[PDB]
Amino acid sequence: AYTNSFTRGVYYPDKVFRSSVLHSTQDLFLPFF
Amino acid sequence: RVVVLSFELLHAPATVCGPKKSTNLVKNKCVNFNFNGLTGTGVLTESNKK
Helix, strand or coil, X not given: CCCCCCCXXXXXXXXXXXXXXXXXXXXXXXXXX | CCCCCCCCCCCCCCCCCCCCCCCCCCCCXXXXXXXXXXXXXXXXXXXXXX
């Protein structure tokens, strides 16, 4: 009936390449767990 | 008769571009570049950024 979601709801918010950086973005994401 | 042309700012590879002709590319030199309307000055080099 129901299960526990996990770290699966993460998508690339845009098409810009970034590396070795922690980037803060606000978008419509699936809440963890 | 009204037609409003809505332009969606570049983010992805562009396919509908203006009449500006391209030129050849020169590496390892300070150049004034314009890539699909994105402008700037700098030296263009080879990279390992995947």
